[PDB]
Every structure is written in C-alpha cells, then in structure tokens.
Symmetry: D2
C-alpha cells in the first residue's frame, strides 16, 4: 500500500481528507524533509496517500531521530485533478520531534479549496 | 446604543465563511433560540447574513439575558442553492450566555459541504 | 471496547480528538438520536469514546435505516474534567442518512475549549 | 489610498484567533516573503497582530505584484508566551497572488496548541 522510506514501526503517519466530497484524499503526494545542520530541508521520505487516504511506512524508528521535520502535502494538484481551482500552492506542517514526549506521530490534514486544517495526534501505542 | 430590540452594543454577532469559494457565505438564514424555563427552545431572534457574511442587530443588551442559547445556521439551504449536496442538515451552536455579567459574542463559522468549524470570540465590553 | 446498540458491521462510527493536548478524547459520552415521525429526537444508541477516542458498534445495518440522525457529543464535561472552562454546552451533528449514497459513516470531531470542527467521511468499505 | 508601502487598499490582511481562550491572538509576529526569481524567499513585509488579532498595512497595491507569497505565523512563540508547549514550529500559508488582476486577500488563522486551520477570503476590489 502507501509506504515510503522502509515500512517499519510507523512512528510517523499522514492522514488526508477531502472536505468537499466527504472522502479521504487519494493519491496525494506527500514529501517529508528534515532540517539539516546547514539549515536546509533535505529529502527524507515521500509517497502518495492510499485508498483510505493514509500514508504509512514513511520512516523507521531507528532513522526517525530528534529534529525539525517538514511534511509537505501537494494540495494544488489534488484540487486541479478534480477540476477545482485552489488557493494554496501546498500545505506544510513544520514540527520538532522529541524523544521524551510520546512516540507515534499522526499528522492529519482536512482540505477545502480555500482552507485547510491540520492536527497532530501524539500517542504511546501504535496509534 | 439601541435598547430592547436590536444591536444595543451588538452583544451577539454571527459571521459565516465559505471554504469552497474563499468568500463570505451570503444570505445564510440564522435562527436563535433561548432555553425556555419549561426546558424547550423558544424563538429568540433570526436573520440572514449580508454581503460580508455577517449578521448584526439580532438582539439588544437588555434583552440578551442570562440563559442557554442555540444558534442554528441553515447550511443545507446554502449549499443546495449552490448546486452542492451537503452532509449536515445545519450547524447548531449551543452555549450559556452572560452568566457572570454581560459579554459580547461573535460566533464564527467556516463551511464546507462535508465539514464545518465553529469558533467563538468573547469580549467583556468597555465604554 | 467502546460499543453501543449491538456491535455489528459498524455503519456508523464516532471519532473524537482533543486539539489542546494532541490526543484522542477519551471517555467522552456520545448520544445518537433518530428523528421520529412526531418529530422529536428519540434515543437510539450511546456510549463513551475509547482509549483511541473511537466509538464503534453503535448500531447495526439492519436497524440503521434512512432518516435524520443527531449525534450529540458531551464536550463540556470533557473540558471540565481537564479543569478547563469551555464555551459550548455540547457539540451536535445533524444529518440525513441515505441508502443510495455510500455506506459506512465516520463522524469526526476535533475539539478546543472555544471551538470545534466536525467532518464526515462517507465511504464504501469498512472505513 | 497609500502607495508603494502600506495599506493602499489593504490588498493583504492577516487575522488570527485563539481557539483555547476564545479571543483574538494578540502580538503574533508575522513574516511575509515573496518567491524570488532565483527560486528563494525574499523578505516582503512583517508585523505583529494588534489587540483585535489583526494585521493591516503590510503592503500597498503597487508593491503587491504577481508572485508566490509565503505568510509565516509565529505560533510557537505565542503558545510559549502563554505557558503552553505547542506542536508546530509555525504556520505557513503559501499562495499565488494577483496572477489574473489585483485582488484583496484576508488570510485567517484559528490556533490551538496541536492544531490550526487557515482560510482565505478573496475579493476583487471596487471603488
């Protein structure tokens, strides 16, 4: 299914939903980046959301170390495919991953042509 | 300002936005009810949003007593008028008003066919 | 786990998340009602969200017929437990369930003390 | 009105709300960038939100040419100032502006520690 840099103990997952049709956003391209010491965004993982609008196996726990990560969702292409003119070029989610805090990260995005919401669910279990 | 009927100091205001068109939601019918002593909803005020997606002059400070109120937004008619089949029948906002002194309420609503967000901004008046 | 009127082929499910803590809202009371011909809301199913903030087995496909349903989420108690003063008395979701349209219904709610968003995901599979 | 610098007809405006307190988010730092010909972000304008959670006078109609712009909202500093540890580093809003004639843009933002919604309201000016 939807997987990126090695399907592992999904410590990071992306969920995308379409608020116009009331369905998950399928085949949306998602690019994850990590902030390098040179302070640039270097590629990390990427993929297309699945039938259920999810993206799993982006990374691994061993490779998912503390740092600033940027999740970029290609919303514009998504709306253009539907023949709908959007407002944003894409949607970004910038956050610092820490070790002390809970483990698994679920980033959710709800999309409309002129608006988008984003939530983080941080828990201890698999989700 | 006004007394016993319209926007005394507009203690109650409603603002609605369209997340599909990136515009204010115009001509949206709004009905306000107050919880009646006999535990039933009594019609309190009604109106439609203007060109700016706003609704003012619903009530007055003297008429806006303590109580539980219900702001009902006819979202369904709105999308239907636009050629879209929405999911909700309407959006309802229920809250206790003025129970520790009068305040000014702005009920904001962001609409999408299958989704809606509502937020309240509360102010302690000053003059 | 979290189940209401007979755990069946979950044609209706409730998902509730807390936007202040970045976690699912656990132990939230949810009451579903159906509009009766007398046009009153008669009880249908109810329960408390689980560890993951979900509520399943509310109803059955045979008993989940077309009609107007109201999902009521006790948000106020939820915030009061956390020692946080909320704005709404509760959150309601009013919608018409139809047969032609897709099958399974997932109602999602994202909560903040002064704001709440709600989405419907309507699909053909189990979710 | 103004030319070459501030709110000519306020072609660009930003409004931020706090979903935890039910109030405007005051003193939130905002940085605007424009995509530079060499594919990099060039500082375009900056400011802080007022008592009303608003930011006006960022640019002028003559200076607000066609281009891709990035509105960055320092949400992190905001919650930290409030004693809360947020999830996002900030909230970024990227869009193409004025590519088919000048328009007026109102970028709205609703904030919660672990969640944020952003909406745009676009107007074709008239005088």
């Amino acid at each position: 299914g939807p997987t990126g840099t090695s399907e592992s103990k999904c410590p990071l997952m992306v969920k995308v939903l379409d608020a116009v049709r009331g369905s998950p956003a399928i085949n949306v391209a998602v690019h994850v980046f990590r902030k390098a010491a040179d302070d640039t965004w270097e590629p990390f993982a990427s993929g297309k959301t699945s039938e259920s609008g999810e993206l799993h196996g982006l990374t691994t726990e061993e490779e998912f170390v503390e740092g600033i990560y940027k999740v970029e969702i290609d919303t514009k292409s998504y709306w253009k495919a539907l023949g709908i003119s959007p407002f944003h070029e894409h949607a970004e989610v910038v956050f610092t991953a820490n070790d002390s805090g809970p483990r698994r990260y679920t980033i959710a995005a709800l999309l409309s042509p002129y608006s988008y919401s984003t939530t983080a669910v941080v828990t201890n279990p698999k989700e």
